[PDB]
């Protein structure tokens, strides 16, 4: 016999080049032999290949023209290879084909015209290839086509409007090409369409009113297209829509109140448009809503209170608008809230007490608002809290004491607030706390005595909050690389054991009342870069050890009263501003060279 | 090539 089936398959084996693992399975011993081969599925009756799965075997080369001899083939998967060059027209001769997967290859040049010859093609996946030029208009002739994916190539030009003739089509992914032009409204006529992904192109004009006609549309993503203009209000009619991504566009005008009808709606993202308006009060009614993201628009409003009662809402991103009024105080009460960032607004009022109600909230960003009152003590009982940044507010009273209990708490910025009294001592207990900024607050008290025992604290800044008393004694100082204490009343000597902070980079002790000698242990710090000791009561001589330090960049000792020679060393080329207002300092830099005798002040 | 999907992940 002469088996076309065998000629075809063996042509495939010789023409595609891959590791042994690929075609080693395909062998002819010395009786319909190919059906036992990897990814070859015969028809139970005819012994013709009805399915060929060649995917994800690193293989290169060109498809041989002999592939047309598998004339019973319903299923061809070449996905996830290194295949290259023009798409072979050979494929278009397999006319019983149903699904064809070309994806995650590198196929180049134009797409070839034969595709319409596959009358029954249901599924076509070309995602992530190298194609250029126009999308093929033949696709519009595929009557049974359900899934079409041309995303992730370099296609240019307009989406062919004739596509809107594919009335069995449920899935169109065009995103991630260079397609231009206005979106053809005829696309709205696709009746069975549910998924539409067009984003990350460069388009013209708006979403056409006619897309409102897509009765069954569920997912709609067109982002980082250059779409602009007023946001079509007829879209509220899409009652099955559950995913709407319009972000990173130029849409203007307001949010049509009609959108309160998108009742299946789960995720909604309008980030980074210019959308000025306010949130429709009707949004209370989206019961399945989960993601709500309005970031970086021009919206100005009051958040509708009903959003606090949205049962399924998990993430809420309102930042970089100008909202006013207060947050709905019922907010966290659904026990599903996970991240919330409302920063850089005009919000006022108290922080809602319920935000963590279910212990699922790990990201709370309130900063650069007008929030007032005390920090709800419930935040200290929130076990999932990870990152908390509330600075630049009116927050009040005393910082509640339960934060060091929190096993995940990493980043806390409480600065630029009105806090008073005492700095919770469990901050130095916090197991993972990496960054703590209490700067510019009004507590008049001393630092927690154990503050430098913090295991993981890298950046600690208390500057310009009214601190009194001495500096605690730097015992662990395990992770600290930035320490900002300047602008307080701290008294006493600088602790001798500052040497224990091995990873220290920047140290600002400026603008205090700190007396005594400058500890030489500073110069034994391996990595120390910025030291600002200025505007203190420091006396005595500058330890000569500091000229031996090859690592140190800014050393600002000015407006103390020190004496004796300035270290010669790396200090030689240092900014002479650093030694000013010390009238007993001596040396070349300050232009009063040194008395040389037996008795000096050094050693 | 890769194309992005899902919601805008800008963060603070
Ligand atoms: C570093 O400063 C702290 C406090 O900060 C400064 O306090 C004074 C010195 C002001 O000039 C401001 O610049 C700062 O706020 C010093 O520690 C503090 O020391 C206080 C006494 O010097 C102490 O007060 C005492 O109060 C109790 C009762 O004291 C009796 O006397 C007071 C007036 O002194 C009187 O009104 C009262 O009715 C009593 O009869 C006393 O029993 C307390 O135990 C205490 O000694 C503060 O409590 C204490 N504060 C802190 C935060 O430690 C510190 O001495 C300074 N050190 C150096 C080296 O100067
Ligand atoms: C611990 O917190 C401290 C205070 O919370 C931090 O120090 C302070 O930091 C702020 C800003 O981070 C700084 O104020 C600046 O803010 C204004 C806004 O600057 C931006 O906005 C303007 C218009 O609003 C715009 O043109 C620019 O984009 C600009 O970037 C400025 O107008 C203002 O003049 C100033 O530059 C404080 O000066 C600064 N210092 C103090 C003492 O508050 C501190 O950095 C932090 N520490 C660590 C380690 O994180
Ligand atoms: C062509 O072959 C492709 C690889 O052989 C195949 O892609 C892979 O298909 C499976 C589905 O069977 C996916 O595997 C997992 O998908 C989800 C999570 O994404 C899980 O819930 C499933 O249980 C399953 O384990 C792969 O993600 C998918 N992609 C890759 C890169 O492997 C295509 O489906 C084939 N094409 C056709 C038309 O069938
Ligand atoms: C907070 O919001 C304002 C406006 O939304 C931001 O201020 C402007 O930022 C842009 C881009 O950085 C600048 O070109 C403008 O000059 C700024 N305006 C003014 C009046 O300064 C501000 O950057 C936002 N803050 C954050 C952290 O995003
Ligand atoms: C955000 O909106 C508010 C309005 O609620 C603007 O706030 C200022 O309001 C005062 C009166 O309280 C007036 O002086 C002005 O109407 C506003 N200030 C200015 C300088 O115009 C606020 O300016 C808005 N934020 C912006 C525009 O960045
Ligand atoms: C703490 O914050 C609150 C609110 O800003 C202050 O007390 C309330 O607010 C104003 C002052 O801003 C008072 O006139 C009200 O009578 C207070 N009650 C209510 C219900 O708002 C308070 O002054 C702030 N400072 C503290 C407590 O030290
Ligand atoms: C230590 O902190 C002081 C804070 O005052 C820094 O000096 C000031 O720097 C700001 C810039 O943010 C200037 O506007 C002020 O004029 C400076 N103050 C003075 C008195 O000149 C200083 O730079 C910090 N040092 C380091 C190493 O970070
Ligand atoms: C938006 O588009 C531009 C160019 O098309 C790209 O550089 C940018 O990364 C895109 N934004 C995102 C989030 O991918
Ligand atoms: C929603 O669909 C129908 C149109 O046939 C009607 O209820 C209404 O006019 C539509 N809403 C609009 C156009 O805003
Ligand atoms: C969302 O509302 C729809 C109405 O189309 C309903 O079928 C569905 O049950 C709701 N959500 C969930 C998670 O069930
Ligand atoms: C803490 O964070 C980890 C991830 O770092 C997470 O798996 C865990 O659920 C969190 N624990 C609590 C109590 O929230």
Residue numbers in the entry:
A (entry chain B): 31 to 60, 65 to 637
B (entry chain D): 1 to 12
Q: Which text from the study accompanies this structure?
A:
TDIF consists of 12 amino acids including two hydroxyproline residues, and is encoded by the CLE41 and CLE44 genes in Arabidopsis9. TDIF is secreted from the phloem and is perceived by its specific receptor, TDR/PXY (TDIF receptor/phloem intercalated with xylem), which is located on the procambial cell membrane. TDR belongs to the LRR-RK class XI subfamily, and consists of the extracellular LRR domain and the cytoplasmic kinase domain10. TDR recognizes TDIF by its extracellular LRR domain, and activates the intracellular GSK3 pathway to suppress the transcription factor BES1, which promotes cellular differentiation into tracheary elements.
To improve the solution behaviour of the TDR extracellular domain, we introduced mutations to two less-conserved cysteine residues (C259A/C540S), and performed the crystallization screening using the lysine methylated C259A/C540S TDR mutant20. Finally, we obtained the crystals of the TDR–TDIF complex, which diffracted X-rays up to 3.0 Å resolution. The extracellular domain of TDR forms a twisted right-handed superhelix composed of 22 LRRs and N-terminal (residues 34–81) and C-terminal (residues 609–637) capping domains. In the crystal structure, we observed the electron densities for the 11 glycan chains attached to the Asn side chains in the LRR domains, although their biological functions are unknown. The electron density of TDIF is clearly defined on the concave surface of LRR4–LRR15 of TDR. TDIF adopts an extended conformation, with a kink around Gly6–Hyp7 at the middle of the peptide. In the middle part, the kink around Gly6–Hyp7 is recognized by the pocket formed by Asp255 (LRR8), Phe279 (LRR9), Phe281 (LRR9) and Trp325 (LRR11) of TDR, in a shape-complementary manner. In the N-terminal part, the imidazole nitrogen of His1 of TDIF hydrogen bonds with the main-chain carbonyl groups of Ser187 (LRR5) and Gly210 (LRR6), and the N-terminal amino group and the carbonyl group of His1 of TDIF form further hydrogen bonds with the hydroxyl group of Ser162 (LRR4) of TDR. At the C-terminal part, the Asn12 side-chain carbonyl group of TDIF hydrogen bonds with the side chains of Arg421 and Arg423 of TDR. Collectively, the present crystal structure suggests that the central kink of the CLE peptides, including TDIF, offers a common platform for the recognition by the CLE peptide receptors, while the N- and C-terminal parts provide the sequence-specific readout for the cognate CLE receptors.
